[PDB]
JSON list of C-alpha atoms in Angstrom, two decimals:
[
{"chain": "A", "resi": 1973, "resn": "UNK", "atom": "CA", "xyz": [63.46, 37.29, -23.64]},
{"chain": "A", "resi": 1974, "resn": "UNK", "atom": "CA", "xyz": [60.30, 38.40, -21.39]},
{"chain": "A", "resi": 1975, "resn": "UNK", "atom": "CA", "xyz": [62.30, 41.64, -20.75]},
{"chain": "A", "resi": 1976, "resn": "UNK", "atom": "CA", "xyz": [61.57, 42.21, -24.35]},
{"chain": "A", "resi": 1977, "resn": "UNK", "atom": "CA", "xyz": [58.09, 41.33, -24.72]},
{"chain": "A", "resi": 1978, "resn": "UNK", "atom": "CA", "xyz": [56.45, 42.64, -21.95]},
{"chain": "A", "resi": 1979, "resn": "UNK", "atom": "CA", "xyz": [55.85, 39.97, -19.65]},
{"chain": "A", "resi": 1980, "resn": "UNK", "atom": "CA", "xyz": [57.97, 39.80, -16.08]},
{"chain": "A", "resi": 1981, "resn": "UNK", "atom": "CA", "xyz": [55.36, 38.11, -13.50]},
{"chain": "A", "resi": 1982, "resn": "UNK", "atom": "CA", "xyz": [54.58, 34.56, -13.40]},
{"chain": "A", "resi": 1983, "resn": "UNK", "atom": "CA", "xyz": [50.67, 35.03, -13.80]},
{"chain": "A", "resi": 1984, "resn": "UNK", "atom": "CA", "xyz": [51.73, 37.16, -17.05]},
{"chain": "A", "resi": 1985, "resn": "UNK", "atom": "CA", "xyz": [53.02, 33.50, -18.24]},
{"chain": "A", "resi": 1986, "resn": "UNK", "atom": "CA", "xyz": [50.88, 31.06, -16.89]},
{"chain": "A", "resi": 1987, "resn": "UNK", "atom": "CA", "xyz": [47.64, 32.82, -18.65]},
{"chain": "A", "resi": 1988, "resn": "UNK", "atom": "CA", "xyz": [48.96, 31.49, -21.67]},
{"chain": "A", "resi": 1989, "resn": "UNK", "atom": "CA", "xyz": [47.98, 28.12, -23.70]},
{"chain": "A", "resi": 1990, "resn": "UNK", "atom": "CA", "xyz": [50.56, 24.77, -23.42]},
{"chain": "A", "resi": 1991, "resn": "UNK", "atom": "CA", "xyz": [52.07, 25.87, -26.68]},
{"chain": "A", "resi": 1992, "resn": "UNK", "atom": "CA", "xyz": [52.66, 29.88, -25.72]},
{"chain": "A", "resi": 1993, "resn": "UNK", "atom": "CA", "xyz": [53.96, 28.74, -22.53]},
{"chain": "A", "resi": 1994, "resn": "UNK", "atom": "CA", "xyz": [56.45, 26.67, -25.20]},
{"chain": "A", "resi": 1995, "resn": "UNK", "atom": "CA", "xyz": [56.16, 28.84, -27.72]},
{"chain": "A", "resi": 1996, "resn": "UNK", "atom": "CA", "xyz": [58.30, 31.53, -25.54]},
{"chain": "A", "resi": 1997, "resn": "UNK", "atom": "CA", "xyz": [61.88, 29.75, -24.89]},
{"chain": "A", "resi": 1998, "resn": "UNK", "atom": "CA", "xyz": [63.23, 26.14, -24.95]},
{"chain": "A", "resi": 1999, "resn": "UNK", "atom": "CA", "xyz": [61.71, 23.29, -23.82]},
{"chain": "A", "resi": 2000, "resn": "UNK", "atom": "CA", "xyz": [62.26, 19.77, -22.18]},
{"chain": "A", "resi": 2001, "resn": "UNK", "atom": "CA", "xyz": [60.30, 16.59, -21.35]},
{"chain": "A", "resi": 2002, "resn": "UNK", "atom": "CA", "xyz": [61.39, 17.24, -17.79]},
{"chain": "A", "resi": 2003, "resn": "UNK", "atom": "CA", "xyz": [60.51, 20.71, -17.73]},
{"chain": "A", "resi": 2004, "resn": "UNK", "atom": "CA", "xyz": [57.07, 20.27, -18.00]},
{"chain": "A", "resi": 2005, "resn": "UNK", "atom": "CA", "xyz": [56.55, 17.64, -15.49]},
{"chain": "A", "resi": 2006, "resn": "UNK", "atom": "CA", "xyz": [58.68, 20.00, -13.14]},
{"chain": "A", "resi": 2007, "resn": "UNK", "atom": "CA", "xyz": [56.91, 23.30, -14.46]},
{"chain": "A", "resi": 2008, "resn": "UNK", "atom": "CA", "xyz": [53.59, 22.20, -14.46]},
{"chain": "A", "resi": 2009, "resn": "UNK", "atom": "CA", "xyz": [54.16, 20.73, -10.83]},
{"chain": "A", "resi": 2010, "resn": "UNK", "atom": "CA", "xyz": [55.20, 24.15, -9.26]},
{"chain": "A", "resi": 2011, "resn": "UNK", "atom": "CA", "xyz": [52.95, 25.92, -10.72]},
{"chain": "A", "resi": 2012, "resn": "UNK", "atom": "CA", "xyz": [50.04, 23.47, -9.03]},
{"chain": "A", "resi": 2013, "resn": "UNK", "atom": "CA", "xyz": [51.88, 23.38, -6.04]},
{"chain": "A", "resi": 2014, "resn": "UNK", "atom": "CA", "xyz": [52.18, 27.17, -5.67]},
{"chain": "A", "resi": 2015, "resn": "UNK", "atom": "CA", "xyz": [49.41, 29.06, -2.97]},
{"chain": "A", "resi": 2016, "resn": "UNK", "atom": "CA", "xyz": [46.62, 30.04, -5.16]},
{"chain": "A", "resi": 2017, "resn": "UNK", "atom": "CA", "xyz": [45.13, 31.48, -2.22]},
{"chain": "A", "resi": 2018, "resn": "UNK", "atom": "CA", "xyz": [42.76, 34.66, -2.85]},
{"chain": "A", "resi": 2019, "resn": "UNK", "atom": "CA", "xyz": [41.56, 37.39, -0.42]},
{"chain": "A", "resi": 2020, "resn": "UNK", "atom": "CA", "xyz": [38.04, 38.05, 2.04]},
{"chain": "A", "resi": 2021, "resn": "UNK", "atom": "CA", "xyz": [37.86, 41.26, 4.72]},
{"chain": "A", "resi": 2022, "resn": "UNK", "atom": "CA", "xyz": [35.41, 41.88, 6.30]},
{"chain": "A", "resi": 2023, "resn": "UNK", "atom": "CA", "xyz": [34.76, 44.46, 8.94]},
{"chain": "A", "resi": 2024, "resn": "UNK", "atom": "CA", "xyz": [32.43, 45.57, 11.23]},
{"chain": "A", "resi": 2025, "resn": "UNK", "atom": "CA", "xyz": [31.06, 48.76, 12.50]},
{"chain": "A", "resi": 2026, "resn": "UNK", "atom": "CA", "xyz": [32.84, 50.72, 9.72]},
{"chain": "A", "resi": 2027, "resn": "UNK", "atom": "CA", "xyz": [30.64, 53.89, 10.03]},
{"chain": "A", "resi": 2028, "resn": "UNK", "atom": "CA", "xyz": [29.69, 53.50, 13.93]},
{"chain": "A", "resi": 2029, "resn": "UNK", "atom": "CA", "xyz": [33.72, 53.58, 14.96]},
{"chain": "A", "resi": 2030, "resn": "UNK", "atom": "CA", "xyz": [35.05, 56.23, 17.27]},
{"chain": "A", "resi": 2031, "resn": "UNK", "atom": "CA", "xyz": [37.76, 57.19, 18.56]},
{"chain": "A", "resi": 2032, "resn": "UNK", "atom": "CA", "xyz": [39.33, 54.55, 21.64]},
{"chain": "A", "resi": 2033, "resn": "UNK", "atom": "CA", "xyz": [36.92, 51.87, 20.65]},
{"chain": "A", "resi": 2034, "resn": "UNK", "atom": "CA", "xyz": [39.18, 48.61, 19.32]},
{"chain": "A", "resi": 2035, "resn": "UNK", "atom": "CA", "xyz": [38.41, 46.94, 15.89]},
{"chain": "A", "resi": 2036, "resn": "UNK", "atom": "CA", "xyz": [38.97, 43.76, 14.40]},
{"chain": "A", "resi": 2037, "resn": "UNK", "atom": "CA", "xyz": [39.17, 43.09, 10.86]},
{"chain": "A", "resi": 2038, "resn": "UNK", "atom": "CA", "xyz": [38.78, 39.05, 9.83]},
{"chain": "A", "resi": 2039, "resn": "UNK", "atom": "CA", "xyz": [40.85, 37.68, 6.61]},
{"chain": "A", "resi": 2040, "resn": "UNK", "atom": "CA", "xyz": [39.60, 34.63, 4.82]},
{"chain": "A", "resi": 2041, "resn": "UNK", "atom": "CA", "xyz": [42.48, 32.87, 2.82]},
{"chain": "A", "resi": 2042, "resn": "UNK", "atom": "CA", "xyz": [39.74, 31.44, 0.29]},
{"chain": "A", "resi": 2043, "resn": "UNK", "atom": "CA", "xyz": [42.45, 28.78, -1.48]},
{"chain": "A", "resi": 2044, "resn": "UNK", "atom": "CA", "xyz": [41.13, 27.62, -4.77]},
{"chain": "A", "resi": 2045, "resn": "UNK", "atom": "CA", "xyz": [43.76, 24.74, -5.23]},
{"chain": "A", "resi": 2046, "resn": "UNK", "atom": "CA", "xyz": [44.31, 21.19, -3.22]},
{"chain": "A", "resi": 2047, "resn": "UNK", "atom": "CA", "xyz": [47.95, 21.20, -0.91]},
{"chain": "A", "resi": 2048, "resn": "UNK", "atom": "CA", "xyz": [49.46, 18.04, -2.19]},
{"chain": "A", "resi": 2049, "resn": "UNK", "atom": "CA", "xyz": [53.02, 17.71, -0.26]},
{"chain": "A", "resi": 2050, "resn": "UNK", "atom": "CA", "xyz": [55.40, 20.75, 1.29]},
{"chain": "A", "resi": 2051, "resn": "UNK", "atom": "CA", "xyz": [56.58, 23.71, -0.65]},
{"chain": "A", "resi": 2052, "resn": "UNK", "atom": "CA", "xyz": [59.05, 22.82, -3.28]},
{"chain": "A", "resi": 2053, "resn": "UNK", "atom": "CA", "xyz": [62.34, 23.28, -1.96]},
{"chain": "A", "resi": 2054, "resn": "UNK", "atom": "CA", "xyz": [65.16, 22.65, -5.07]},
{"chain": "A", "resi": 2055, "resn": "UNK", "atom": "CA", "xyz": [67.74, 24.31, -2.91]},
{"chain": "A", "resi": 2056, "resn": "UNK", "atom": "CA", "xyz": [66.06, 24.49, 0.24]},
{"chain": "A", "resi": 2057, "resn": "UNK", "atom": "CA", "xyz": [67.78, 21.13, 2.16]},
{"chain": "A", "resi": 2058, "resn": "UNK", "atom": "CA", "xyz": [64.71, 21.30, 4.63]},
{"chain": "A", "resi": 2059, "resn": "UNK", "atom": "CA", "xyz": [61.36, 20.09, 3.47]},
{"chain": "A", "resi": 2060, "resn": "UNK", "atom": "CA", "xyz": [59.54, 23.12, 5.52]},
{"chain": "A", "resi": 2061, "resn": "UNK", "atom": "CA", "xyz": [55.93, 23.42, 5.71]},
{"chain": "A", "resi": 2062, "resn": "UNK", "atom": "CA", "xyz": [54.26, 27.12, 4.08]},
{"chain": "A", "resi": 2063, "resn": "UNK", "atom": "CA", "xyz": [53.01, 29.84, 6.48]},
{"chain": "A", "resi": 2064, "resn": "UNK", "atom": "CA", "xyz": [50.97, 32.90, 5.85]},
{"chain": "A", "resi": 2065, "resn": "UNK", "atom": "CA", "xyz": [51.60, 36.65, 7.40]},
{"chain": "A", "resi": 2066, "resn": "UNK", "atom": "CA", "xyz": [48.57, 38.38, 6.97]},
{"chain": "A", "resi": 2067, "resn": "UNK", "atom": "CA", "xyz": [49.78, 41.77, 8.41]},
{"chain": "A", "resi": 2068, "resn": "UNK", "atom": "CA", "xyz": [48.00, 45.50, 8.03]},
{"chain": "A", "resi": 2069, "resn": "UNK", "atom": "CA", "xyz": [49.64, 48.55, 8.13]},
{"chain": "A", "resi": 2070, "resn": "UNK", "atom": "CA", "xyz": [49.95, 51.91, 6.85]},
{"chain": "A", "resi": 2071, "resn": "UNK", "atom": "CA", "xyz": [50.96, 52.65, 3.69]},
{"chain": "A", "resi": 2072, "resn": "UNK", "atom": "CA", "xyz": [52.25, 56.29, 4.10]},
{"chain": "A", "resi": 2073, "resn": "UNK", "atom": "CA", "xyz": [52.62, 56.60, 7.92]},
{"chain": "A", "resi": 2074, "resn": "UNK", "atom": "CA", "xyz": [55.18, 53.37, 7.76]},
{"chain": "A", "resi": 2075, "resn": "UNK", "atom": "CA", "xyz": [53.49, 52.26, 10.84]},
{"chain": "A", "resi": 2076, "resn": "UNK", "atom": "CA", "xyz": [52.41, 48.48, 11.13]},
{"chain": "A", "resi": 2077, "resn": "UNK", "atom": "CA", "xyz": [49.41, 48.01, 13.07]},
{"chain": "A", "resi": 2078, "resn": "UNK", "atom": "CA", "xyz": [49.03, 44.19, 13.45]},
{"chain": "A", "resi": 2079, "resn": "UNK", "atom": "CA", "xyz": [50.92, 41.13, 12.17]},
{"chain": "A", "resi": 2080, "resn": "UNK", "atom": "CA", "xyz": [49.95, 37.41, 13.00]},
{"chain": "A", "resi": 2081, "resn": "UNK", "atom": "CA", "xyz": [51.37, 34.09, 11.30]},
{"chain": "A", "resi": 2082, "resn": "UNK", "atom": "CA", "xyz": [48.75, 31.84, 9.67]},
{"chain": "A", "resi": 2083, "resn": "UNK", "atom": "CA", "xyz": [48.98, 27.70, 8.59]},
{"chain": "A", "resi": 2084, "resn": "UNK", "atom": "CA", "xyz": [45.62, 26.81, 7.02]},
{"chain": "A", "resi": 2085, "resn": "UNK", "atom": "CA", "xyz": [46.46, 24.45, 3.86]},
{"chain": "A", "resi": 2086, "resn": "UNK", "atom": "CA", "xyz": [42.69, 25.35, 3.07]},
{"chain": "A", "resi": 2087, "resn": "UNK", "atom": "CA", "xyz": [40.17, 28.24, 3.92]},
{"chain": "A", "resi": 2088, "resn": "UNK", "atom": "CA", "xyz": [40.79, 29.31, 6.96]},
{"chain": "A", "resi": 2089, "resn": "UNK", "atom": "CA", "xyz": [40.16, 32.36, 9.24]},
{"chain": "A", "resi": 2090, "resn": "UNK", "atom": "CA", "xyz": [42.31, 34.52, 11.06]},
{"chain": "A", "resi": 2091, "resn": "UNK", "atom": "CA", "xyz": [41.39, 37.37, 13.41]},
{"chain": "A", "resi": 2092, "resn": "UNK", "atom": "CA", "xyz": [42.90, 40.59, 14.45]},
{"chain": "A", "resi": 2093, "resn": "UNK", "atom": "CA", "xyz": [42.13, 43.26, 16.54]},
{"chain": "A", "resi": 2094, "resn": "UNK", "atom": "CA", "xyz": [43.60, 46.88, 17.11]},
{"chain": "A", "resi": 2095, "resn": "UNK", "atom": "CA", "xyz": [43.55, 50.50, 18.34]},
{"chain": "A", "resi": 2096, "resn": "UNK", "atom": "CA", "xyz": [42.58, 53.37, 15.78]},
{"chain": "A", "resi": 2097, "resn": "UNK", "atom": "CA", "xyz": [43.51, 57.15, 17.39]},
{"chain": "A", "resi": 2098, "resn": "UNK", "atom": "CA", "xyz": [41.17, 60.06, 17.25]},
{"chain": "A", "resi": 2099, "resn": "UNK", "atom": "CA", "xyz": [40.99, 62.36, 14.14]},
{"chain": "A", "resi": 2100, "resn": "UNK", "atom": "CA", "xyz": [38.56, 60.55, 12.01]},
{"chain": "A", "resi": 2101, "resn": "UNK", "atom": "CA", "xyz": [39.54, 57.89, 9.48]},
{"chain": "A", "resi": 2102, "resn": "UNK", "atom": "CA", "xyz": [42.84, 56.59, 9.04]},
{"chain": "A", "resi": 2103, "resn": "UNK", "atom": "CA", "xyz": [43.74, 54.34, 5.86]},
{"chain": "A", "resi": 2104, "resn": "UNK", "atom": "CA", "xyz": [45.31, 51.42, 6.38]},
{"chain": "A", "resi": 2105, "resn": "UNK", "atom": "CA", "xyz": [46.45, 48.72, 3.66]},
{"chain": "A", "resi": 2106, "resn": "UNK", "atom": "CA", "xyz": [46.22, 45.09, 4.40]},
{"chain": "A", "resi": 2107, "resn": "UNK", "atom": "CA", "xyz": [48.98, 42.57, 3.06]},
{"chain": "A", "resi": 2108, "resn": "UNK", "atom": "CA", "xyz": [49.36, 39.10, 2.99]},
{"chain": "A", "resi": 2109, "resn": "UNK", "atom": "CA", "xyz": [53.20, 38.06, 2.64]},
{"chain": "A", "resi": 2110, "resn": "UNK", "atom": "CA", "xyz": [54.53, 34.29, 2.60]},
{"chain": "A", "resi": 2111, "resn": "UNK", "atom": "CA", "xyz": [57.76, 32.54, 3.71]},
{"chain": "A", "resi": 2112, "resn": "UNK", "atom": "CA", "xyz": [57.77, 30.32, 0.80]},
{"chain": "A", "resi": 2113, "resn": "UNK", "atom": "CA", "xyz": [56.58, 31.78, -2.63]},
{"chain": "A", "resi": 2114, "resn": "UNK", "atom": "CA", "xyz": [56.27, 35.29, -4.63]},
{"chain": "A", "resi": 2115, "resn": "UNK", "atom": "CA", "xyz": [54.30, 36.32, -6.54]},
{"chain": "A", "resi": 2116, "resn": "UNK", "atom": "CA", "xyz": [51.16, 36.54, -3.87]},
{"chain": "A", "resi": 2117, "resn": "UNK", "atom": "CA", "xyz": [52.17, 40.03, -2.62]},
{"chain": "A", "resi": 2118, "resn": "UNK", "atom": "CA", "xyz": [48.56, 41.18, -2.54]},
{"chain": "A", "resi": 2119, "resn": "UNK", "atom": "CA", "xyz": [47.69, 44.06, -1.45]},
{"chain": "A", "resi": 2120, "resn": "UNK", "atom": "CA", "xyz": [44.19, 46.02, -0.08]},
{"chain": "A", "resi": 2121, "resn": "UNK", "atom": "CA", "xyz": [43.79, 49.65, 0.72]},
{"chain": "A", "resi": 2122, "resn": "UNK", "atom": "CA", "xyz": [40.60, 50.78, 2.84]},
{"chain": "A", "resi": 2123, "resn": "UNK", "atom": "CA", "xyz": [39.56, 53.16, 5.62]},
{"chain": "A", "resi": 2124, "resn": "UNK", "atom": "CA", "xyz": [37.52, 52.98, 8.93]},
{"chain": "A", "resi": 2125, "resn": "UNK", "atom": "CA", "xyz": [36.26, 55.39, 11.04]}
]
């Protein structure tokens, strides 16, 4: 049924009113106290960069980039785990790497349950600037796939 109205994604569903989101299929008195509870208990978890000496950056000198996971929603209890027979806590990989070279240039694991900071340092070559993309990828949840293309140096 979404196939054939143009919606796939989860945020193309919950933008909708409490009667569109049951105005699309069937609906239950225990699907909305389990719906509405997943959908709170997902990361709602946006992006921050920041980075410094983005003109003044040669070639052998290292730079760090710093990544604030600004979360705009309260952690109340572990990720929901239906099928999942361990009640595992969520972690964060906010990695950065290149987007046509295939190479990854840094990776570390993250556990916040609020804003946090995480900082990571690396090695750019010579040849001017290089563009790099910066992901952050969970263990947990879809759906937060997102995604920044820049350039230094």
């Amino acid at each position: 049924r979404c196939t054939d109205k143009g919606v796939e994604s989860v945020f193309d569903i919950m933008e909708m009113e409490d009667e569109e989101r049951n105005a699309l299929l069937q609906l239950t008195d225990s699907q909305i106290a389990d719906v509405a509870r997943f959908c709170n208990r997902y990361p709602n978890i946006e992006l921050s960069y920041e980075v410094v000496d983005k003109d003044s950056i040669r070639s052998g000198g290292p730079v760090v980039v710093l990544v604030q996971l600004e979360r705009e929603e309260e952690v109340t209890g572990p990720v929901i785990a239906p099928l999942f027979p361990q009640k595992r806590e969520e972690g964060w990989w906010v990695v950065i790497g290149d987007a046509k070279s295939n190479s990854l240039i840094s990776i570390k694991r993250l556990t916040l349950q609020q804003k946090a900071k995480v900082k990571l340092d690396f090695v750019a070559p010579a040849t001017g600037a290089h563009n790099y993309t910066l992901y952050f990828m969970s263990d947990a949840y879809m759906g937060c796939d997102q995604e920044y293309k820049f350039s230094v140096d």
